[PDB]
Every structure is written in structure tokens, then in C-alpha cells.
Design a protein around this ligand. Sequence first.
Ligand SMILES: [Zn+2]
Ligand SMILES: [Zn+2]
Ligand SMILES: [Zn+2]
Ligand SMILES: [Zn+2]
Lengths: 372, 372, 372, 372
Amino acid sequence: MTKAIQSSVQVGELATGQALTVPIYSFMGSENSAPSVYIQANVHGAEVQGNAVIYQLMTLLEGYQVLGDITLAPLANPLGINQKSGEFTLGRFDPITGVNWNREYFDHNVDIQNWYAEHQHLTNSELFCAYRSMLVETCQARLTHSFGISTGHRLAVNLQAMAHQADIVLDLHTGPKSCKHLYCPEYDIDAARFFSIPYTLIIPNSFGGAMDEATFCPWWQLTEYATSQGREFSVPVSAFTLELASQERIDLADALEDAKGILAYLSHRGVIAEKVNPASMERFGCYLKDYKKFHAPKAGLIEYCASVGEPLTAGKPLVNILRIDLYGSEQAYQAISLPMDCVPILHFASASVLQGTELYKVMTNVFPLQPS
Amino acid sequence: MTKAIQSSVQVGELATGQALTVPIYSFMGSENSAPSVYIQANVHGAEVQGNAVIYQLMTLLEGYQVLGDITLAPLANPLGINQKSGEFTLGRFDPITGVNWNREYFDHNVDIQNWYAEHQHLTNSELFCAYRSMLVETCQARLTHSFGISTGHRLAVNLQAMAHQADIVLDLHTGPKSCKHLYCPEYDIDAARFFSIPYTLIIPNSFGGAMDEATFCPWWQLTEYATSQGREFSVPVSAFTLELASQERIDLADALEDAKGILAYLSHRGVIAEKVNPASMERFGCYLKDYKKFHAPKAGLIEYCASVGEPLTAGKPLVNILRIDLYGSEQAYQAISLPMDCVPILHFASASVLQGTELYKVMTNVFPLQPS
Amino acid sequence: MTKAIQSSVQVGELATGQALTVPIYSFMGSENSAPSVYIQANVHGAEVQGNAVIYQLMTLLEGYQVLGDITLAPLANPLGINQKSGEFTLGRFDPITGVNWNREYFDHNVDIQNWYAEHQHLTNSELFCAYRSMLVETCQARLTHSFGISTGHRLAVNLQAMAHQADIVLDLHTGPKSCKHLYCPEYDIDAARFFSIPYTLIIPNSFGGAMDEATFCPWWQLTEYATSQGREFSVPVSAFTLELASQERIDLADALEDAKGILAYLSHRGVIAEKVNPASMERFGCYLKDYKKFHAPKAGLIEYCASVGEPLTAGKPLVNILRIDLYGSEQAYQAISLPMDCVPILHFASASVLQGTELYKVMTNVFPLQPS
Amino acid sequence: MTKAIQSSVQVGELATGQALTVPIYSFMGSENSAPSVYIQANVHGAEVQGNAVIYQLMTLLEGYQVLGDITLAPLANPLGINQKSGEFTLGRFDPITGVNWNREYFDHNVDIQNWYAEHQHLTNSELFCAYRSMLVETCQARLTHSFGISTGHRLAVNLQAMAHQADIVLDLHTGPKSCKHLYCPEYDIDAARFFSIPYTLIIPNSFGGAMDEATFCPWWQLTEYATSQGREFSVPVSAFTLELASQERIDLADALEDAKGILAYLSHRGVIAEKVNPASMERFGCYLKDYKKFHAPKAGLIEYCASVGEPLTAGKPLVNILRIDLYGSEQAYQAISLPMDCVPILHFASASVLQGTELYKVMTNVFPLQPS
Ligand SMILES: [Zn+2]
Ligand SMILES: [Zn+2]
Ligand SMILES: [Zn+2]
Ligand SMILES: [Zn+2]
């Protein structure tokens, strides 16, 4: 007997007339007081582990008292999830245009001086309520532009309209071959210690088309502006992108670990009644500017020597490149290392690369979040 | 006995060790006085007609006296050109990342006040020479960043390094199912009447990652800045993107028409000794902001009623949508029209679409370039 | 007020849980006497014109008296129809395995001597009824094998189970860039003159995995066997594959022409009450063994000189190959012709090919079907 | 100072004019007495581990005395190896037609009664020499058919022409997510104990388009026929397909293990002078008919519970299927097991499947090869 109310939302339509739909599960909060939450997975279609996280999270929630509304949208991009090419989900971008599904969210470009002038007389709570209504409506308005909008923009807008309703937004992703990491805005670095995530990227106030930024930027802007008029309060919305290890993988046991960390955060925020403690583990971070993409310096076949999630001392091998077309030479086999210490986070999912193919992303200038 | 000197440039490398190379043909100019030209085709791999244009152009050039250097780079993106998916060239974007090959060019972000202060003492010709050396070197420098650059950025940079050497840059493209059209910066609208192209889009001074913008923007910036210090001269470089009808098509007769229009422009610019007159035809334009993408308002099977390159009076059908899944209803067949007059330029190459698929691009607020 | 009863059939299931369904329209026959018909389109997902044919056919049928059941299955392969790669439907084969959807039908391998021995005592009509029940059941049985069957086999089997119920089966396809042609078994060449199709391929009694063969072979086998026991009757089932010009195209006017030819055949067979005459046009055929694939003798860019559907005298150019990488040589441009007269039927949809890419299929040893 | 002589063979040509080439390394044998060997890898382009095996094998061979010629063809399908789709090598089939590269080899259809009658007077050694010349020439003849042959047939034929020259043919492949296994014809089961491969599939005398069958079938046919004329000798050629664990992976240490097992076999056959012993390990086999494909009984997200290469007792879980679209039901999570004991060999590389997607291949009726 689940507590969840199940519905569905139409996000697009296929040529055969079949609706593209996303299933929505809602755990109603018992206190109108409590912060609400919107959790989605699998916008990048290969990144399926978020669905297992939602499954474990909802299973746990059957036994916790939910104070604030929790809305979960697994399988949030059916077009991408269902897109196969060989034995692999071509789920990252529109197969027609190449546009990354996670770069399709809407930037409101709010005239903040003006909007604030028209609503400054409201209390902090009323001001936040008006501002949220505006973010929802202007988002919904994109759906009825007379020359239309792209398939990817329609998907993104429908998801964003729901995300805007929530106080807390969690966008669940995976990397390729990847360890667990988190994208966390600067203003909310405090929150990083509640998730069960060893590595956090601290991101600035900047819109680059992603769900987390679409969700927090307008609120960050409003707050910095209000502070410049001597009206201090903390950013009313929190948004995070979780990167739950590797794509093309479902692991229920690992998903339960991730779900418990999420519950630790929801507990701390008063979304649930129970105290759920964060896991004990070493947690580190770096600023986004220090997170670097290493591109193949030449083409070849690749052995990935450096383990994801483990420190790599400068000079230790990151990859070996095999060039069997050059046997007889020193060029046939080459160890490649980096000139600084790093923590490699993820690497490319195939063992054959071109010159310029992304091999790894690595964090540099890493530090403990919670030094102890 | 061709006058062309043939060479080749390496633009990347495949996993098997095979070089990605672009063939380069150079017709040496006999006057160090004359403007030089760089012409490339087929960066978008499906857009093969530019190769036929280069072939007809070079055939013609065997009989004209070349005053200024002409460099031609057909087959400029071998990775994209050779990328098949079904009976179709998946040539528009990196198949790994989805990044559009024509959005990969380098924006120099020149500190223009500073650069100009260091070089103002030079004559106009010397200043232009110094500025060109800087554009070439900083472009070449991108090739040796220590974490590397993407496959697409390496391609784009190698092409751009050559384009920067020229006074006149022509990037030859095609649309999908498309009529002939041209992208022309505002400052050079005069040039549009020399090409054999009925429709021209007038573009502003704005960098969006394309070859034409990468080529002209720095020069446009320098000129507007110099004019603000009371030093007036016209923009020293010209760049144009030609859209030579439809992709996945080679038509030598049509390519000869296009080549003759190109020669008309090179003649007018003194690149060749002969007077070659522009073709007689009606020519029109619109500002870029008036060129609009019409997205499918619903999914279905599409009949493209409006001919590309012909005026479409408001209310006349653009497409019919067939929905054979809804037979028995009025929804089974639907004429779709637009609320304003337009000239449809191109449409989508497939007859099955989703909600949001791009159906057409159409020009609005069209006017004669050369009213007579 | 359509006469059609609309239903739907589930042919598979997507990872997100969405059913793959095919819409079914049935015009009930008023005479239990009359032959029944099964018509499907778009098993190859790019081959969308068959849907327009079904639309025109059903529109016409609203005004004809239907004597025998007519079942229509447009949009018969939703997975394939909805599979995009660039601006093109990758609809021909399973994107995971490469298996051609039209090579997935089930060969019953009937022990014909035995089956006939057990049922020889039945009248011709009863024997045909028993045989049809067996073909339907053994087909349906494939759906519940304990290790399962492939995605493509499940699709094919569900379609075939319906096709087996009918006396007349029409599988509607298109070629790539193609003229109208028909695949007709040898025993039913008489039927070819009723369709509005200039070129017919006469196929033997041979199973190669296609819907037409899956449908007619068992009946052809039964008949030849019965004839060897001195029991003469004509093959009780008719099956045809129609190739309705080019893929990625919807043309309602052209579809109406095709629908009228289909009605001419259904009329002649007594499926409808009215006399509908075949169109007046020259009709030709060749045996399948004389229909030939011409492969690119070298790679390059291709201009398709020979028009589909028109005779090509030996020595007249089929294609020109442009090799802009070889400018300066005779190899840069090469006319390719064939050593015998032919009728080119279809050619490759892209203008860039490899060595060995299929360029054309051409009929040789062509003759009038209906010499006059 | 490598002993290998390096050359290259052209196997096709790309639209830009670039040759498709395969690098060939030859270790000359010092005894005209000794059996020769042809070893190729990576015909399926994702299956890159064979290149690492060739690298380790050649490194070892620098220190062994080579008695018989050894020819190695790594990177044997550059078109397939270089074909990317997302972060994955779409290397299994022609991206244009869907035809599996490993189903493209040539079946000679030798009229064996006739050929043998014309050559019976020859000694066994002379007969084998004549027969090999015929297999090479008729293969080469396929390259000059006047309507050409497919891209895939041209590749396959060029490889096969070399394979036919050798006494021993090793085609090196990988599975998807897979343990090490071997395809071994029935007549040569003895050879299986020399490789370092725990599981062997015993295949019959049957041509299905693969390199191993193209190589051994004609010789198997000749031998069975000669035996029917009272002329007994053992099949003069040996061919094996090695499946070296998982695709999209290079592991040099694991490749060295595989190379040592190959050397064990070459030693036993007198291709090298040294005695190299086989590895000590348990080895098992099953007949091909007992090796089974398990297809997804419904669509969903998949957790692969059964480890490849380990026995799975009937009733133990093979996969769990997660259906997050059905949360609240028993259908949300389902353990799937098999009704008989098996050894799962490989599974599907993605975690999202359709109804009918291949989940695993499993061996049944397994037995020790070398019971002890
Ligand atoms: Zn993601
Ligand atoms: Zn383009
Ligand atoms: Zn077809
Ligand atoms: Zn393989």
C-alpha cells in the first residue's frame, strides 16, 4: 500500500502519434510549513542509476513521516532513454540536432531591479511566493510561442515548470566511467556534507543551460540584489546535480547508499520528521575552474590506469596509449602522466580514441570540505 | 597542366593511426598588390555541393589571370564527410559529443583598446599586417595547450589559421532541402549583389562560433574602435557563408552557376584581371532577426507544400500533417499556414517529425537588395 | 462517419515501459463469400509513403461496397519509424543488432507430405481452412518460446499472424530514390497488370525472410505438392510487395494514384462490389535474377545522371564520380556507364560513397508484361 | 630491432579518397617445413583487446625461434574501428546496410567430386597445395566482378585471401561484457586444451559467413570426401575464433595471458622451436546447439546478477528487472532465473532493454574438456 500518488506528464510526441510521457510520484507533506522537494533522474538517457536511487528512496519514504511535499520524476527523458545505437544508449543529445538535453533549460533574464521595485513592499515569504509564481508562469508561457520551440526545449521547460515549484531540487545524473561526485553552488556548500558523495564541485552563479542553474540562478540573483538594498536573507532555493557513478548501470545496493545520503539532507532540511544522520566518510571539493578535461594528445587504443575517485600523484600514469600500427618503435606504447597532483573523477567509456577525444576529467587543487 | 600547387594539411588523427587530412590547392597571385582569398567547403559533411563549386571554380581559374593568392580547401572535414548512418551522412556534429562542427571556431577576445594603443603609430597597412600576424599566431597557439583541445576545436583552429591569412574568406555550405542563400555581414551588404544568390541574410557583429564570424569579428571590432579614435577606414576583411541549395547532392551544372557568381565577386575585388559581370537576377534580403524557425506544432508525417525560394502569402499552406493514427477524425489531415507573408528558405529533409522538430526556416520582412 | 472499426495491437515494449503499438483499421465485408485482405505499411521506418496510400485507400473505401474483410495496418513498425539519426529515419534495421526488419519473418518448414496425408480427405475449401489455422497458430506459438525471441522477430510474428488470416496480402514499401515497382510471385504475374506500377520483378518460390514470401511460400508449397498427387488447384493466397517511389516522402496526390491501382486489383478479385478499371499505362517486368545491384567501383562524390524508371541504353552515363582530391588528373571526374541496356529502378540516397557502396539497382532483360 | 617485416594492405576506400588500410606484420619462418599462421584482430570494431594480444604476442616472438611464417593483421577493419556513435564504437556492422562484418566471408561452393577427380593423382601434399592455390585465386577473383561487390564483402575477401595461405588461422574477437571463450570445430577439439580459455564451443561443419568457417569448411569438405574414397588424412587446416573477454577494453596484462596460451598452441604445432606449456586451469566445453540466447521477457532497466564465466545453478537469479514506471506493484522489481543449470558466458553491454533484447548467452550441458 504505497503512500505515493502516481500521475504522468506529457513532454512531447512521436511521429507515430505516441505521447512521450514521464511518470510522477508525489508523497504529500503533512505540514504546509515544510520545504518541498523535486527529484528527477535520467534526462541523459544512458544515465539510468538515478531510477534505482528513486526506487530506493521511495521504498524508504514509505516508512518515514513526510512533512513537506516530495515529487519524483524518474525516467524523465523517454526519447533519450529509448534511443539505442548498437549496444549503447545514445541518450545525451537530440539525435537530430546534437543539442545536449541538459543544455536546454530556460534562463528567465528577469529584470531584477524592476521586479523587486514592484514587490519590495511584500514580506520575505510573500515576496518568495510571488517570485515563484512568476518563474512557473513564464516557463509555461514558452510552451505556446507561435513558431513553437524545439523538442529539447519543450522537454526541458515541462521539467523546469515542476522544479520551480519546489524549495529543493535534485537532478540525478551519472558520469560515464565515473566515481560519485556532486555539483553544488557556492552559497550552499554547507549542504554537501549531508550527501554520501566523496567529491563536490563548487559552482558559481552562472547560467549555462542546466537544470540546477535554471533553478537556482534567479533566486541567487534576487538575493544578491536584495542584499544590495540592505535586505539580507539566505537564498530561498537549493539545487544540486548528483553524479551517481557510472552510466549504463543499475546497482540497487549502491543506489540504497545514495538514497540514504539524500535522506540525510532531507532530514536536515525538515522535509521528513526523523533525524537521519549523514554517512561517515572523507569528503573533498574543488572549485569548478580547477576541474579539468584532459584530451587525448594523439589517437590510439587506451588503457585507463588511474582509478576514478583516488588521488593521482603528479607523474603517475593516467593512461597508456597503444599504437599497434607503429610496432617496432617507441611510439607503439606510451605512458601518459599529468604535471600536477589530481583526483581523476571520470573517464571515457570506450578504449578507442581520436586526437582530442576527452580521456578524463580530473580535479586539481582539491581540499577537505570538512577538515577534521 | 593545372596552375594549382597541391598540398595537404593534417587536421586530426583516427584511432587506427590514420591521419585526417584536407587537400589544399593554391593559385599563386602574380601581384603582391592583390587581395587574397581562402575558400573552403564541406565542414558539415553532408553538405557536399561546395566540392563541385570548387571543382568548377578551379577549372575556370585555369583560364583567368590570378592577381591575388587563391587558396581552396575542399573536403575540409574528412571525419564528418566519412561519417555514415544509414544512407545518410551524419556530418553536422561530432558523433561522440554532439557539438556542431561549425560552432567550434576560436574567438580571440582581443583587448582592443590595449592592442591598438601598442600599434597606433603604424600606417593603416602595417597595422593590418601586425593584426593579421597576431590572429594567425594566437590561433596556432591553441594547438599546444597542455590538456589539449577537442577534436572539433582542433579541426576548426587549423582551418581558421589559414582563413586568417586571407583578405576574403568564403565558407561554402548547403542547407538541407534548400534554395540558394547567403550570410553577409551588415558592413559588406554591397558585396551580396555579385554572387548569384537570390536571398541574403544580413548578419550583425556577433560571435556565435562560426567561420565567417571568427574571421570578420576581430576586424569589425578593430575598425569600430579605430573609428572611435577618429581613425576611419573600411573593414579590411570580407567573410561570407554561401548556402548552395540542398545537402547530399552534387550537381555540376548548378555548381558552375555558383562558381561564375563567385568569380563575379573576385573580379570586382581585383583578385583576377578580367571583368566578370554578376548574373542578372532578382536579389532580396532580410535582417537575421527576421529569419525564423518554424517548429512542428505536433508530431506526424509531413508533406512540404511550400516551395523553397518562392514567396508564400500569409494563409497559404506551408505543410500538411498526416496523422494516420487518427483516421476517422478531422485530426487525420491538417493544413498548417503562417500568419505573415514569408519566403520559405529551407525545410527538414525527412517526412516524419516529432513535436518541436524544425520544419522550415522562413524569411520575413523581405526586401529587394538592389531595388530597380 | 467512417465505416472502419479501429483497434490496436501491441508488438513490443520500450525500456521506459511504453508499449509499442500498431493501429488496425478493419472494413468488415458484407459477404462471407469474399476474399479478405491484409494491407500494411512502413515496416521499414523511412518508407512512409505507404501511410498516405492507406489514407487514400480508406477514404475511397468509405464510398465502395466492401464484400470481403479489409484490414489495414499503417505505421506497422513504430520502433523503426521513430528512430532518428540526424535528419533521417534510421528505420531499416534494428539499431542494436543490424538485423533488417524485413528479414525477420517466420518460415514454418511445414512437413508437407505428412500434413497433406493427415488432411487429404477434406474438400479443397476445408483443407485451405485447416492449413490457415495451422499457419496462424504456429506463428502465435513463436511468441511464448521460453528463452524468448528477438525484438524484430516479435514484431514480424505479430504482423504475420494477421497476414496469415487474409487471402490477399499487400506489404507497402518504398525504395530510396526510386520509381514505382512491384515484387510479384511467378504464379501470380497476371495480377501485376491491375496495379498502377510500371515495373514488376517476378520472384520465384523461395523464402528469404520477407513478409510476401512468409505469406505465399507455404501455400505455393502446398499447391505444388497437391498437384504432384494429381490434385490440381491454383495457389489460394496472393501476396505482393509494392515499392511506392521514394522514402522520406509523403505525397497525397501520388498516393491516390497508387490507391486507385490497388482498388483495381481488389475489384478484379471481388473484394469490392464495383468494377474499378486498372490505369492505362505501359507495364514491364524482369525475372529477379536479372535485377542487379551496381556497387561503386571507387569511392567519391556522386552525380546520379540516369533517371529512375527510364530506359538506359548501354554506354549512356549512369553516374559521374567527382574526386576533388585528385584535381589536376583525369581521375578527378569520371563518367561511369554499363555494358548492357537496362532500366535503372533506384539509387542511393546520399551523394558520398565508399568503394562498394550500392549506387543503383537496375533491371536487365526487361520485357512488356502485356505486349500490345 | 624487431624481426617483423611491416607492410600494408588496402581493403577499401573512403569518399574523401582516403585509403582504408590494414597493417601487416610478418615473422618469416626459418624452415619451409613448418606450418604457417595467420592471426587477425578487431574485425568487429569495438573488439579492441585482440590488438593488445597481437602486441604481446609479437613482443614475445622477438625472443622465440620462428620456424613457420606468422602473419599478423591487427586493426583489420579500420572503417568499423573508427566508427563512433556517442562514447561507443559502432563497429559490428556496416552503418549503411546493417550487415555484420563477420557474416561477409566467401563460401566457395567447391564442386568437390569434380575437383577431387581432377587432382586425385597428386600426393597428399601436392593435393593440399593445389587446393590452397584454388581457394586463394577464387577469393581474389571476387574483387573484379563487373558490377562490383559490397564494402563489407571487399573487406572480408581481402582478409580471407591472406587467411587461405596459412595452415592455422586465428580470428581474435571479444564478447560484449564477457568471459574468455573459444569457437573450435569438432574435428579439432584437441587443440582447445592449449589455449588459456576456460570455455569452448564445439562447432559443426557448417558455413554461416564467418572467418573461421570460410577457412576450415572447404578443407573439412575435402577431407570427408577423400575419406569416402578410402583416402584417409586429417583436416590439413585449423581455424579458431578466440573471444578475449569484453569489448571496449584494452588490458595488457590480460593480453599477455592470452598471448602465452596462443604460444602454447603454436609450440605444440611446431610453428616455434621452443616448448611452451599450456596454462594449468580447468577447461570446459559445450556443443554449439547447447549455447543459448536469453532474450528479455519484458522491457526495463537491468541489473546483471550472474557473473560471466561462473556456474549458475537453476533457480539462481540471472537478472533483476527494475520497472520504476510500475512502483506500487509487484511488477516494479522482478528476479528472473533459468529452469536449468548453465554457465553464463556474456551479457548485454547496456542496462536498458526492450522486450526481446538479448540479455545473456549461456552454455548448457557443459562438461570438462580434459576430465581429471
Ligand atoms: Zn548527465
Ligand atoms: Zn553547413
Ligand atoms: Zn522496404
Ligand atoms: Zn566479434
